[PDB]
Amino acid sequence: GSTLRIIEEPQRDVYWIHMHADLRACFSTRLVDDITGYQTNLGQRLNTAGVLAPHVVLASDSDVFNLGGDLALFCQLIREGDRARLLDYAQRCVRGVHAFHVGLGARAHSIALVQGNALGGGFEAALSCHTIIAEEGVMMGLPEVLFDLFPGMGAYSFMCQRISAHLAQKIMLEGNLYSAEQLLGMGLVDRVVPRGQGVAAVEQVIRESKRTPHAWAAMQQVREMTTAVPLEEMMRITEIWVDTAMQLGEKSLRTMDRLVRAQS
Amino acid sequence: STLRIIEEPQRDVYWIHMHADLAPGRACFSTRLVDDITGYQTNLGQRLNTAGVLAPHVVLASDSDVFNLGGDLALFCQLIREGDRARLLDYAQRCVRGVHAFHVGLGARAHSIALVQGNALGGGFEAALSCHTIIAEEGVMMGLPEVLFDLFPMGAYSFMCQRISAHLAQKIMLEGNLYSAEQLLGMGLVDRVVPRGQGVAAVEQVIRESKRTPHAWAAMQQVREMTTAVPLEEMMRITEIWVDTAMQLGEKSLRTMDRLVRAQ
Amino acid sequence: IRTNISTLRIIEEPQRDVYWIHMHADLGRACFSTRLVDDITGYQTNLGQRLNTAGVLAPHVVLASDSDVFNLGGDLALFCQLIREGDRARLLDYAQRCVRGVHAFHVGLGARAHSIALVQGNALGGGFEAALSCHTIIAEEGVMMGLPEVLFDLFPMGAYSFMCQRISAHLAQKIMLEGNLYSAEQLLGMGLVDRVVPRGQGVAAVEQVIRESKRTPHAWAAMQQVREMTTAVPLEEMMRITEIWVDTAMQLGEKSLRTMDRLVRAQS
Questions:
Q1: Which range is the signal sequence, renumbered to this chain (chain C) (predicted)?
Q2: A27: which of A181, B161, C59, C64 is 20 to 30 A away, CA to CA?
């Protein structure tokens, strides 16, 4: 769990997950394992304690939110032809984001606090939460498509919850980066605040939300039988993602190599 | 006794005016009102089918200074304090049958039109959303403020998702805000907004337009049935969720509901 | 099993896997005549087969028009003839053929192709639906689109299915029933079209979409696979809707039929 800085507030049942406590700021296998590990642990305690409508905040201790998938790993596994290991990584990432999407199995309120740039998997992670709070500037998008890498952490599924299937498709293929304000007008982020005011915004959401715990839980039950993204669906999409990733040529791999270096 | 019905078999237009019995009490969905509405719906629907009338029109309106204040809070408090889940569930199921009937045109592929000339809160707002066309007069306020005392909203979510994103629908349902007709129009939650006292004229305009394309309307309804229509069974599973949550309302929520009844 | 595919003017660029289909090369009114529909479906199958065999990744197919309008929709003259003769069989056959044509664009000819509709003239009824079936719609200023046929009680195919991909089910219904015509600008703000450009700049706009899109072939193919298992409109669904369409069409009254008669003459 060295990759995470955890702050737990049992009294009010608010829990903070800070990524990149070990520090590129990406979803390394260690970070993914640490996140899923904590999600499972926290979810178990919440269930066992019978807590109603807990809040879980996803944040970052880095100057960026999260740069997405572990491109260095992708290049290694693709060049080695290790589909099995790549698929496993993808599935673990999906379990992570889906957990936020369904409230860790504890009907929790997941809040993404984006105070830096969120690219690829990073943007997907934010979209997996119930509420997205971003500061100015910040920059969010899936530019990885520009070297022909299909987004692999539920971008389409999560976006369709907020926008049309067609627009979601356009955004995913275009490879553009959007400002927090642009995303707000697009309905992809919920609140935009000045720099350094992110945490304050999160507290506002919590305070307002904590006044309707049963209503929240009920809403979550309804989502579960209606609009919720099925984990089984996301897994079938990971098969598509891995198959496409494994077909990346050296041009793409080399570009990914250069990106890692520039960011690292 | 709770309804003032005006039938025009000449042009197959049927007006349902709620709250005819008050002409003194609370303008809400009392058990009697719900029974009266569902009873008439079933009767009219069967009559229309037997007569084979194509694309009839049914208008939901109110004779009170408000459209409808929603669920019978006075009843809820009684049943909740008595622990009578059976009766509460039965009430909920009857309400769902009523709103779903409007949604599917009474089983006669009719055109449901909600004429909202007064405030529509909770169930009242949901009733309007269950119709195919919502006509509101300037100044009118609609919303689901009951969530503020932790009472989950019926078919609100189901109906809203027909007009807006699942994400936005969820946010609206949990915020507990009231919206003006003007705002609702820009949000896509109401279809037409006209000056006070012009509501009926607006309804007649919709009727005239629609009556000029009966076969096309019937076809559209057939398509809806095999695509986007909200399943009755789905709404009936949601009632289970609703009752389970309602039965857990604390004393403070009950007192708040008590006061609201008195005030209204 | 290849076979012969003059209602179309085809321009193929295998050098870059781009293929242009220009409707109304034979030009009566610029609508979906039985001849045009057969020409389109025939070419779609031929090209699709070639693309599949070649294993080409993310080919582009452009639907355009050589007429001053994009497409006026269904063959009203044919409808009136069949309806008055009570020939449901032939009417249904026509509808199903149209559905196969539009669905093919929707699913990229079964070769994961990127379908682009270049609308430089009015697109009515089937014409508007045809554009909505594509993945990208590029329109020029001044162009009007809509489904005014509903006005004489003719139900719009897959218009509803295709619109629900871009807008709410509720708004789709209203647009489907109102019978209004919308400008390219209006459609853009509504999310029903993707880009609006000045007159005569349509082709340039298409080239721009293609040039940029060609940088992400594998990504496109993957997206199409996801669409297939999630939000793509099933051919089965459209076929069931054709039954509803024909049953309604066969019930058109004298007034409607006469209105259709005059429309054909006016447009012709």
A1: none
A2: A181
**Nearest chain C Cα distance for residue A252, angstroms:** 10
For B1-213, CATH gives: 3.90.226.10
CA triple B142-B143-B149, angle to 5 deg: 140
CA separation for the pair C45, A234 (Å, rounded): 32
> Looking at the domain covering A1-212, what would its CATH class be?
alpha beta
A23 interfacial to chain C (CB closer than 8 Å): no
CATH tag, C1-216: 3.90.226.10
Token digits for A126? Answer: 């934010």
Q: Is domain B214-264 in CATH 3.40.50.10330, yes or no?
A: no
Q: Closest by alpha carbon to A80, among A245, A262, A255, A231?
A: A245
Resolution in angstroms comes to: 1.8
- Out of A187, A190, A218, closest to residue B241 by CB: A218
**Nearest C-alpha in B relative to A221:** B241
Q: Which class does domain C217-268 fall in?
A: special
The secondary structure of C203-259 as a DSSP string is: HHHHHHHHHHHTT-HHHHHHHHHHHHTTTPPPHHHHHHHHHHHHHHHTT--HHHHHH
Other Cβ atoms less than 10 A from the Cβ of C211: the count is 11
Q: Say whether B214-264 and B1-213 share the same fold.
A: no
C149: tokens are 């046929």
Task: Note whether A218 contacts B171, CB cutoff 8 Å.
Answer: no
Residue C101 near residue C42, CB atoms below 8 Å: no
How many angstroms away from the CA of A223 is the closest CA of chain B?
A: 9
Cβ–Cβ of A169/C223 closer than 8 Å?
A: yes
